[PDB]
């Protein structure tokens, strides 16, 4: 868990990496008692008894968001994240784990390694990590690689400095959509 949880760094919401961590003892009891993650939002399943619960395959969508963009990602509620960056479908059957990671992520002056789609050309699809930062074309002036009028580069610097408040700070989030139990003996 720690490997795909609190690592040296994470990814952005435009290129979130889903890690298949399965075929092992899924100890979520240790995650619950550690309680080092502000949010646990287990939507679809129970997070307290997730250890004993035996699934077939578990994911780990790894990405960082702001403290205001940590609410955006939601099964149903759409926004700059759940409609343009990382979409969470309503069939979510896993747990969204969120915690602030300024220490090993937020670089002073804003994180430049993290960039998020502020204006994705088309609408993002459920569970999609669009990596193409095509300039948004606003009706007229086709922005096919062109910049200027009606042209808005989607990928925008994710302002993440330790001086920033919690609402603009890197929230390391690994969501484990379930589709790997405890003792079972």
């Amino acid at each position, epitope marked *: 868990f720690g490997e795909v949880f609190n690592a*040296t760094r994470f990814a*952005s919401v435009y290129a979130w990496n889903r890690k298949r961590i399965s075929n092992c003892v899924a100890d979520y009891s240790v995650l619950y008692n550690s309680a080092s993650f502000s949010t646990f939002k287990c939507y679809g399943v129970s997070p307290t008894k997730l250890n004993d619960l035996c699934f077939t395959n578990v994911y780990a969508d790894s990405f960082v968001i702001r403290g205001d963009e940590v609410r955006q990602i939601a099964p149903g509620q759409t926004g700059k994240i759940a409609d343009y960056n990382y979409k969470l479908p309503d069939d979510f059957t896993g747990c969204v784990i969120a915690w602030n990671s300024n*220490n090993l992520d937020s*670089k002073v*002056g804003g994180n*430049y390694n993290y960039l998020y789609r502020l204006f994705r050309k088309s609408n993002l699809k459920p569970f999609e990590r669009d990596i193409s930062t095509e300039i948004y074309q606003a009706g007229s002036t086709p922005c096919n690689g062109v*910049e200027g009028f009606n042209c808005y580069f989607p*990928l925008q610097s994710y302002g993440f400095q330790p001086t920033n408040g919690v609402g603009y700070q890197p929230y390391r989030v690994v969501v484990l959509s379930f589709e790997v139990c405890g003792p079972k003996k």
Partner: antibody
Amino acid sequence: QVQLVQSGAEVKKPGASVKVSCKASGYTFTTYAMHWVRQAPGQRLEWMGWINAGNGNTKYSQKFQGRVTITRDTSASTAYMELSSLRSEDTAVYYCAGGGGRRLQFDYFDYWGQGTLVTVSS
Amino acid sequence: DIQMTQSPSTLSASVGDRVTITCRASQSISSWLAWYQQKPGKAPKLLIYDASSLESGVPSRFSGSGSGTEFTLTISSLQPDDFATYYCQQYNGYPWTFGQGTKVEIKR
């Protein structure tokens, strides 16, 4: 392999302005990471700045606030820089680098140009 | 600004040996560092980033360590290919500085 090449040796005079430039050789242009650094002869390396070879972003250093500028040309996909109001201390070797390539941005220097010589004399 | 001093300024070695390098930071760093090699009359090499990681294309001798403040560089055996200075770089925060410089020579 990604390669960086630039101009040659280059001798200026106090008060003048100077322009160094490097062409890139990138398998991808995925918000490439032009990122300049400096080297006073055999002493600390002191850092130049980074232009966003993706679109236009131009973040610079504090000690060189207000006198250094950088851009890039896209279809040439080269990057250029001014360097203005030159002075005697200013003599050094000038390095292109960057080229994150895999990821979108970094803050480390993984593809260096093999160097430019600037001599400020009277 | 982020302070950077490196010890010792110069060191000694002989072929087929281990040489320790320590990069000292005044103020706290979260594994924000890179190790570079510098041959005379040259453009720099990178071989450690992130205070641990070994970047591709390098001999396997090279190995970073440390976190927090004290940072350390390690090589097991000493090739002639190792005879150059070595610089440490922080990237915890703004304007990014370098070290002082740490060369090996040839003992006899």
